[PDB]
Design a protein around this ligand. Structure first.
Ligand SMILES: Nc1ncnc2c1ncn2[C@@H]1O[C@H](COP(=O)(O)OP(=O)(O)NP(=O)(O)O)[C@@H](O)[C@H]1O
Ligand SMILES: Nc1ncnc2c1ncn2[C@@H]1O[C@H](COP(=O)(O)OP(=O)(O)NP(=O)(O)O)[C@@H](O)[C@H]1O
Ligand SMILES: Nc1ncnc2c1ncn2[C@@H]1O[C@H](COP(=O)(O)OP(=O)(O)NP(=O)(O)O)[C@@H](O)[C@H]1O
Ligand SMILES: [Mg+2]
Ligand SMILES: [Mg+2]
Ligand SMILES: [Mg+2]
Lengths: 47, 372, 372, 372, 47, 47
């Protein structure tokens, strides 16, 4: 059976921790925003 | 089902094999690379994407991407390429007839497990799947039911205290400081001698330099004073193009960021204090056994002299009557996979698998109540 | 001592003067030139070497070489000529009685700074000397104590975040992409119209073309589409011999390599993403003030529209709530020198000089524990 | 369509044939000549212009014009005569039924390629056409997908690095120094012995002298010292009128301008240093394979001993641990044409042609997004 | 179909490179100028 | 007092960074080697 989809949340860049925008030069850290407010970042593959 | 598979998908390395084996059959970096140059020759079979060892070999023309950062998948499209390579190209097996035991660091986002489950069941159609904690598996490889496991890989350092068959989740600690941060720090400190490694392939070059030449000093200030007389501690490393570099005090300043995270600008305490805090967060009666069974595991803990330094610092923190023992096997780099293969071949573990029937009737959220 | 000297001797331009002045007294390229043709006329007062503006004046018969490349001195023999010209011909002062404040890019080789100190103390006999970071001085000129300085000179681009006087060295980023690379790129792309500037004097000609006519597009694809109607964006330039060249879309393809380094074949992020990464590597509580006080400095940041483009790109990266403000003072070229003249004249700074007594005591290595 | 034509329209030579052939069917100089004297014999079949070998035969009463200079067409009215001769006289074919593959040097003006496309589609009505880089085709003739090609024709020298199918356009270097400059230099230096070749026919005579007797010294200073005791290195050459000249140290001072461009008054690096710079501008991990696969091609690289000198010079520049290998095929004069014939007959290449239907809907500018 | 014409730009004579006026004795290096600006040279066939 | 000398290390040519051999046409990039190992390059003033 198929279940709808697992939506991975947008990454929050803290001082130091789970996520960083500089980690992967091959990924572009695109801003994710809904309702006009920024929810975080996700690593698209362009740069 | 023929046999179970064990895949230790760490931040930087992928270790795949079969349950019951004593070593991973396939080991390759968790890298997806794509060409960053023009391409003028027609034919030649120029693929638009390379995975694992092939990407490493061709890295001179590729932009290398790690789909996993700090033990968390940042790009699932490339993670699916990693898994497809792992199953069809490395193991040469059909996932539809083999259970898959995956690994994850503790305190990960819950959606990371859910998408692992969804991909394993919907795109690979695995009959069964499980997601075990990396440090818990490492205790299996040590043949112990009691002790604290200090596990450091490419992206995550975590400590899990385990008494007799029982873990203590409140005492589990995690640092987002591991081999990747040390590689970047070595890249930044090699510029003091004029070396300017910047590209992703040069990141792998610096990682090789780190793995071959970095080591943990027993006394940092004394070794700095010794390296001030700069003739003995310096080592030469030949780059892939023939130019050789000289590295001196950077050899031990390179792993020192593990014990002094302030070298990276981090506020967190070192790995020695992380283990001590993890032990002190447990019950008083069990601390004595955790001190004598401090298991060291992970590829980052492969620096020479790291066990002696860990013993030196923990003896200074723990009460003087405790007998501190740092248990560093020769196979720390594969302890997680060995424990996963042991667990996946236990008769008592066969009912702990997430069955395909359970996924059908419960969805990806089954992983939270079935695994851990 | 009478007064302090400030020498912002960057990769491309030497900018010298006195502390307390609001503008450098002498500005000339960091160029040493030697004749490349047969001297037939006896007498004439010929010279085996020419320095600075004199080399530019007679660059036709001269081969021009930059002692500094990427903020690092590659030939100290010509650096001694450059500094001797600066002291005895441009400023017309004796270094024996003036403290000297020098400038250096961050993440430079440590031996480059050491030989700066050694030459200043043993060859020019300066009573005192100091080496300051170029981007740090630009914050002094702006009058701020909080903000991130994006300095783009001729050899180096670097960002230094500072919050209430405290710099964050772990967040400092460096790009080896600056005006020299853009000049070479413009030389490359001008061949599409048949212009074949090859010699070093023609490199200066192309640098003049770049400084006069190159500009930053707010939307690169829109500007390309507009330039497809090739009568509006085209500009004429007259060569020193009178031939007139026409430049078109190259005018904005000329600075675009700053934001798309892949034009140069490089893997690094653009200058906009470098600043954003530098801000994100800082503490969460201080990023809001770094966004509102992003300061531009250096000669390369003098392109028209670079402030608006940097503003546009950063607000698309930073969270929508932040008030992205780019500060681009008209004195962007001399921002480093003005900050150095301010710092050297501060009463609280007079005990931070490296004294000649300290040099006798400690040697060239004194500069590492005294300076940034 | 019957078959594809390949025309290697270099600065000095035209080499034409059919795809799939192992050697060009027609080879003749790219020369258009017109009479410079009074015709007095009525009839006689006199004509206002001669092309190719007929111009060479009649060059005494003719003024010889090269429509191509430095790989760029300077007079299209004569380049069209060259192409008309190539099609209707040398190959004896109708271009309206044969796709035509032309060659061009890199970093050429974009209008030169556009007029090639426009002439091929609007005057010769070719069903399809394509423009390929000369050095790229030379790698095809070598049976390689990895290596750096140093191509030296009559007008241009260029190096193109390729690694496993992908070229690095940022590392491509171009020198406007080739066989024509060497011929003019030999004309200049032959005046030291009183030989005063001045006309275009005498330029062809000096070109023949250069091709027959000029050679590359392994050690220029030692060969000069050996030629100082002039007995053995001198050779005799007979002019077409019966007078014989003697050439001495000029034989190896003749190609030395390739390695020391200062002999011509040029500032640029030698052909050995340009190749080394092109290799060093590539990625670190691919330089090792570029060193072992340095390919020489073009008519200018046909000097005896040029491969040994190139090996000697690059060995002194490259790091000592690299194995420098200079591949100089015996037929490297036609290496570009052989690669073009291989490419034009490849099955996968047949969908990369610029079709007549594509030119009709897009015009001459189609060539920029199709060929490179 | 006929597209209007490819206009080759006037040659710019640098110190050394793509173009020179001395290369071809058979071509006259005529000056090309539009308005008052001399855009370069082109090789006519007279000398 | 006079300290012995600051020895500038040989420049290591990476893909893109601090040093390049093509930057200065006036400098010859002579190879630096000690023992049999190539330490890097330095810019002598001959070309
Ligand atoms: N001999 C060595 N010396 C030093 N560091 C090493 C050595 N071998 C491996 N490493 C480091 O450890 C990394 C691999 O360790 P590994 O245990 O495979 O990490 P992982 O499981 O991929 N990541 P994680 O999710 O953090 O466990 C390498 O990429 C290096 O950073
Ligand atoms: N108006 C301008 N437009 C564009 N670029 C310019 C302009 N003026 C100067 N430049 C560039 O900036 C350079 C000089 O800037 P400057 O701030 O003096 O650099 P530097 O301090 O010498 N170099 P570094 O040590 O790497 O910071 C010139 O050589 C050009 O490359
Ligand atoms: N045996 C030889 N020895 C030396 N030089 C030679 C020899 N044969 C030919 N040449 C030179 O090489 C030229 C022809 O080389 P070729 O590869 O046909 O150049 P091209 O392709 O016409 N020009 P380009 O546009 O630079 O590729 C001659 O005109 C001479 O200058
Ligand atoms: Mg691990
Ligand atoms: Mg500067
Ligand atoms: Mg050729």
């Amino acid at each position: 059976k198929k279940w709808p989809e697992v939506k991975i949340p947008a990454r929050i860049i803290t001082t130091s921790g789970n996520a960083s925008v500089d980690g992967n030069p091959g990924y572009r850290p695109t801003r994710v925003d809904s309702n006009g407010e920024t929810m975080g970042y996700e690593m698209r593959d362009r740069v | 089902d023929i046999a179970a598979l064990v895949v230790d998908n760490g931040s930087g390395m992928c270790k795949a094999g079969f349950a019951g084996d004593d070593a991973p059959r396939a080991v390759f970096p968790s890298i997806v690379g794509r060409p960053r140059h023009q391409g003028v020759m027609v034919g030649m079979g120029q693929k638009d994407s390379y995975v694992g060892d092939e990407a490493q070999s061709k890295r001179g023309i590729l932009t290398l991407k790690y789909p996993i950062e700090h033990g968390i998948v940042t790009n699932w499209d490339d993670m699916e390429k990693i898994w497809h390579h792992t199953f069809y190209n490395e193991l040469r097996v059909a996932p539809e007839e083999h259970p898959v035991l995956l690994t994850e660091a503790p305190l990960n986002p819950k959606a990371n497990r859910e998408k692992m489950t969804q991909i394993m069941f919907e795109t690979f159609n695995t009959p069964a799947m499980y997601v075990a904690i990396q440090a818990v598996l490492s205790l299996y490889a040590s043949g112990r039911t009691t002790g604290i496991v200090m596990d450091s890989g490419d992206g995550v350092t975590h400590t899990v205290p385990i008494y007799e068959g029982y873990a203590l989740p409140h005492a589990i600690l995690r640092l987002d400081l591991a081999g990747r941060d040390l590689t970047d720090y070595l890249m930044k400190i090699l510029t003091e001698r004029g070396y300017s490694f910047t590209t992703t392939a040069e990141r792998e070059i610096v990682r090789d330099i780190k793995e071959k030449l970095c080591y943990v000093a027993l006394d940092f200030e004394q070794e700095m004073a010794t390296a001030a007389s700069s003739s003995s501690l310096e080592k030469s490393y030949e780059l892939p193009d023939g130019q050789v570099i000289t590295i001196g005090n950077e050899r031990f300043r390179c792993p020192e960021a593990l014990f002094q995270p302030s070298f990276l600008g981090m506020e967190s305490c070192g790995i020695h204090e992380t283990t001590f805090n993890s032990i002190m967060k447990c019950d008083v009666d069990i601390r004595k056994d955790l001190y004598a069974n401090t298991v060291l595991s992970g590829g980052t803990t492969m620096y020479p002299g790291i066990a002696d330094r860990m013993q030196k610092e923990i003896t200074a923190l723990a009460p003087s009557t405790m007998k501190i023992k740092i248990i560093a096997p020769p196979e720390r780099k594969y302890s997680v996979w060995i424990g996963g293969s042991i667990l996946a071949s236990l008769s008592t573990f066969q009912q702990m698998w997430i069955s395909k029937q359970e996924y059908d009737e419960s969805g990806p959220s089954i992983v939270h109540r079935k695994c851990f």
